[model samples]
Target chain A: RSLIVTTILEEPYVLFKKSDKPLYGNDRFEGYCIDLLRELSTILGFTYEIRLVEDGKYGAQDDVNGQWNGMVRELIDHKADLAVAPLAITYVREKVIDFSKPFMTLGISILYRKGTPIDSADDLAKQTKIEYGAVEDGATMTFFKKSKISTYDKMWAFMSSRRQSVLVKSNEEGIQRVLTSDYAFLMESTTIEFVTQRNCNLTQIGGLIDSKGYGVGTPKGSPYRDKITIAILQLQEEGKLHMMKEKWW
Target chain B: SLIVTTILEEPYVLFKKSDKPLYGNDRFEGYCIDLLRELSTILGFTYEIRLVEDGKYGAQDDVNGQWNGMVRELIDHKADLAVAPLAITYVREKVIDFSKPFMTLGISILYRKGTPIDSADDLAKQTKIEYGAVEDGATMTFFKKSKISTYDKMWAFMSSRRQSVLVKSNEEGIQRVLTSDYAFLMESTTIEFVTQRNCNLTQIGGLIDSKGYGVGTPKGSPYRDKITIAILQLQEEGKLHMMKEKWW
Candidate 1:
């Protein structure tokens, strides 16, 4: 049976393929995640149709309503058979859906313009002259919201107080803000690395705030979850995951 | 009912010395003992602690395709948990479930102090000094299955002198390092424990590969996810680190 694979369009993960002619179906997309999905399909011997998520959010819980949005919602509603993206395997998400073993290990980091005095999250939190925030309704934001650490708690207070101006709609928006104003964008370290390499003016500040991994998401009680996990481990053991990262980054 | 399978290892699990005979779980005391107690407290599960019969950490046989040690116990439904210093490796994960790591560590070289040899690459290039890990253990499995150039070259050397290089246990490997011109490629956690007491021995290099020690359960067991959640809770509360410091 053909599976409906839900994903989001992010740089170097899933992106609109560049071509002179009009692209159709799965051919329209290309990036690290596209390649990963293709490899997973080949290994598991299943056909799939890739579709972009409707909400375009990674996945976050609405604290007021106790509802989930983005790829996580798709899985809970069984609208999509799998979610193959850079979705972090967090504790809350794990309760709602099953995640394959992490294929990529990463942590949260700061993305800032060069020549800034900001060295760490603490630096950004201690001062108001420079502002910082993460993608609104994203894992990074969720981390700050839930963290018990004093520095992170203080940073969260600052961001929450100025939510209108601080929180960004997307990583792209945050990056643009960093480039244009006295802002530092909090984001995943992997994306920060990709951005810094391509845009020399941008740099990652300080070390990781916390460690986590990006996993393939499936609905709760899905049989395919364990199978995908095994396949990911096989790919890791064979060093194909590293090779894929090298190809993309 | 829960039957917890574990192995005798320094700092992790050990027999408590007493003039009088101790019975049941009181016979053992160590980091894992404290961890098991903490887990029991959080999850409210009663358990019987049993040492693995074979004394092997856990490994799959090449010919018969049979598993031995605590993994086999879990696989056969003879035990509900294997809560030792079990590594979260690819091969083992195929047969069983693992909670998120309670502790993270990596494979490193343990050698005598003041050695010019600094890294795995240094050992891989030179034949003057020999290095090897416990036979059929995770460290050896890493070298045996690795495709990395330096690791593959080192595996070639180890496999050539298989009988002489591959020791029966980390204890034997450590003894070899102390007695001969050998470097023991073992888990970093154990190396730290060893180096603290034996000032002559020191970690030769940074971790070659990163992995974690997770609680093992039978495949498709209901307890796996709950245990994982509890582990994460302990970690977040700083209890895991406190326990480590208490034991180590």
Candidate 2:
């Protein structure tokens, strides 16, 4: 039986399998989330059909609005059985979707251009050359404001400037911009090993702005919720999640 | 219909009765959990609360693959809705859902009734000053990046800190601040909504930085859309603004 599953095409996580065939349900359909779902299905008893989802349409951008709405749109649009991507579990998301216990964790690390004369955010701010600031999302932005800068009063002075640093839409966007920009830096750490394995071009700047982790996001009131939580525990106990990350990365 | 959710923190959302299964009542409970809780309620709905692990909301849990404190439960549908005087930031928002924020928070220096610790600058000028901040997550990070006082090159001054301790929560931050003669607690929501009975912590100044509290929902849930409007309505009517004097 084919159960519909949808995931983003982010590399190292979920991407085209090098075949033109649309995702129809296959064993090779696995990554961080897929690995988790495979483990969950054994306990939940369902064969998951995997497919590529338009990352933006699939609540990646919706999270721009709020966490739970992103999940609501995911299921309401029939995009996925549940959002099991490198999803960050949140209290707000719980209201709208069902999620397993957290499967992974990450936080925001401010990545600054190495060798830049700037040692700290203030150094960047004082520098007439420091030109842009890109944060992954709300958390990194918050971390940037709370963890690194004393007050947005000064933080905004840089951003609000006509030369305001740009705010990247996603963790990936922020990371990429910072990796190349002479003065650009990204506020991100929402995901770890996955991003770590994906990119070696960037290094975390200063300590993490905010410490965070990822969880399995499901739908609201999902029976699979608790079951998946236990399954994740099992994965940890069984050494599956740990070994899987190593295996994939 | 709007249904916001929250966890029982202190004077903010804890059971007014405290002993009952589902206790506490009010459109706006301007206390401990009000940051996110109040917004959850006024979003034109009532919310549900579930008893689960009360881990630090934003703190990373290294044991469970860096799982968030209890956010996974919220993200994974363990609970329908969850909230706190929760700090709203993109770091946490990416994984979970959040509504437009209802509150702003920041770090402040506080001391006993007449303690000498005055401002961030005084501490910054001192050579032997070693202060204690709330925690490693959001509160301390702000301090790390900036000088406690003068906003100028705050990020630079903070990065040079020789010694600043990280505590677990705001209460601990406050306790540490009050007990020590030199220690200053760095925390958020300078306007902490403590219970009438609970006193001792004092907010020193206006917010260091402003961040709002938003209700989180699963990604793509329709309810998230519904709640956003409710929150906007409250903010639009100035209901949220009017109530500020009552709490902060």
Candidate 3:
């Protein structure tokens, strides 16, 4: 049986493969996660069909409705067997779904235009001259919302005050805002690395504010979780994971 | 009752000094002891702390195909949990289950100050300064099994002088570095602990590799997942960082 893998289109992770002729099925997609899925399939002896998440969001729980959306919802509702996206392994997500050991470790950081005076999260939190925010309802945003740290708590208050204007719908939107306006995007360090390498004007503003990992997600109690974790560990030990990261970024 | 197996390591597990006789779990005190206490309170389990019969952390013998140390204790059903500064490695994970890492660290160089050697490559390129790790430990295993050119070369150098270079413990390795022209390849966390107290010693370069210390259990144990969740909770609440600060 083929596994239905849920993912999102993020740069260097999942991307629409360019083709002169129309591509079919998994052939239409290519990127780091695509390569990862192919490697996992070879090791686990399984075939898979990749599907973009319906809502195009990574996953988040709605505070008002208590409903999950995106890839997480796909797993919760049993619509997908695996979530092969840049989904963060978070405490809240762990309560509802099982995550394989992190395939990649990263931390939250700031993305801003080069030559900016802003150097750290503390700088952004201290003043209103420069505006900063994160992808709406994403892990970066959720971190600020749930954090009790004084600096983060203050940043959260500021973001909430300008929620309609600062909170972006996606990373692409946030990156565009950073390029177009006096805005800084709070995003994962790995993505910042990817962006800064490709765009010289964009820079990662500060050291990592928090540490976390990206893992393959499965429904709670799924048998595949342990197998996937073992496979990831194997890749890490063999240095294949590092090679893959180098290939992408 | 859970029989928890651990090794005596500084800042993680160590013998508490007292004028009065101490017994059972009370005799031991360190970061891991505090961690065990928190885990017990969360999981509602009684445990007996037993130091591993063999002091080695755990390694597989090449010729005999036998395992030793705290890992063997778990594999042989002699303990219900193996908690210490045990690294969650690929080989160990094949035989035993580990909870989500309670502490993350990586291999790095521990050397005295005012040395020309600044990185692993610097040491690898030259032979003047001797470098090695604890015998039968994760750091040693990493070098032994690595395919990277610099690490492979370093391993060849260490293996050539195995009898003299491979120390029995982190303490021994640290001592070797202090007295001789030596660099100790050790975990970053331990280096942090030692460098804070020893003014002359410093960590060379950054992490050579990344891994974590996890609570080990017998393969297929039902408690692994629950323990993982609890560890994640502790991390989210900043208790793990607090515990590290309290001990280190």
Candidate 4:
């Protein structure tokens, strides 16, 4: 049986296999999450129909209205059976849906121009001269801030004090903001490492602000929760998961 | 001449001396003294500097709902400007107006050289290590309500045995962090300034929450905009950064 899978296209994790050649449907995507799903299919004996989330986000809750958007909404609305992205497992998201065991660990980091005087995102907030923001729907922006954890909530207090839409639509937009002006882009450490390796002009500042896990999401009460959990553990035991991360990330 | 009030904090403001023992503005020297001179020089105003009577930076007392110290001086219009090392915070901002930040800093962990802590996470998760922040400042509030009650977790860990680590002042916190297996949570700029002179102590991790230091005035003071512009001018001229380099 083929399961409906929802994901967003982010670089080094999910991207078009090749832009030079025309591609169609699932062939249009190939990256970290894509490959992981393939391995899951072989082990679990079920293929998955891949579709890009129309919203192009991990997820965020509207602070005023309490509505959700992005891949998280897809799972909640039952439009997709599984969500396979570098989705962060945060305290807020845990309340709304079920997450499989963490597949990876990462922390929030600040991406800035190499020579900026600011050492961390905290330093960035104390200044009015420069503009800074994180991905709007990203767990680093919402899930972590809304979390009841001490450090994470403190991080949100700084973030929420800023003008709205300092929250950008995507990580690419945030990185672009950092490149073109005096803006600091806050994001997951792993993606930052991936970006900094390719771009000499950008660098991560200080150590991680807070540590968190990246996990797959399933709707609450979904049967796939236990099954996905088993598959991830099996991959870890066989060392294939570590090898996969090494291969793609 | 405008009446300006400051606190007796070192590197920010301190009593100075001359063989003749000069009176008035000639009696004080420090970073705030220099910056005050710069602002008065640019703004073309003569001023008298006085020390706050209560010797506090300004903290509100919960029992009486009364605020004391230099901020109170500004609030009562007893002083035209508060040129001390008054930290700009949400609570102070409500009762007073601040110029553009003169300096930027954040909450940081202070530990002795041999201490095993590298970040707040290390302190939060461990039992053998004890840590504390200023008793009633924004830093303490952040650790307490910054989340639900994790600051309470640390508090619980300590007080369950009838011991408490909370401190009355930054000096007390730093002293405690130095003499024992305790970590002092304080502003990063102060941490940097202190760690430079004291090799036995170091700051751990990135900052917890961002903060800044600024010149303060009474709420809706006539001089608010004027002081803000003067400070902005000094900022643009690199005088503020230069002054910190010299004193801090």
Question: Could you tell me every candidate's TM-score relative to the true structure?
Answer: 0.87, 0.45, 0.92, 0.52
Off by over 4 Å in 1: A112-120, A199-204, B14-35, B103-122, B146-152, B174-180, B188-210, B234-248
Candidate with the larger TM-score of 2 and 3 = 3
Q: In candidate 4, list every pair of residues with a backbone clash.
A: none
User: Number of backbone collisions per candidate, in order?
Assistant: 0, 70, 0, 0
For each candidate, what is the lDDT? 0.89, 0.52, 0.91, 0.75
For model 1, the local distance difference test gives 0.89
i-RMS of candidate 2? 16.7
**What TM-score quantifies how close candidate 4 is to the native fold?**
0.52
Model 3 residue runs over 4 Å out of place are: A19-21, A113-119, B17-21, B114-118
- Sorted by TM-score, highest first, which candidate order results? 3, 1, 4, 2
- Please write out the lDDT profile of model 2 over residues B1-248, one tens digit for every residue: 32234554544454454343544344234453453455556554555454345545655544674545545666776655555666654345556765544444445665445445566665556545455565545555444444223543333444455244456555665566656644454544443554223366555544445345556676556665455556545543335555555555
In model 4, how large is the Cα lDDT of residue B118? Answer: 74
**Tens digits of per-residue lDDT for model 2 on A1-249?**
656665654545554445565555464465666667777788678876765554442342333654323444676555566666765443344445655544654444456544545555555556556565654334344334333234333654566453334765555765566556664554535343455555665455555433334556555556555556556645553446656766666
Q: Which candidate number maximizes TM-score? A: 3
For residue A210, give model 2's deviation from the true position in Å: 2.0
Error of 2 at A57 (Å): 5.1
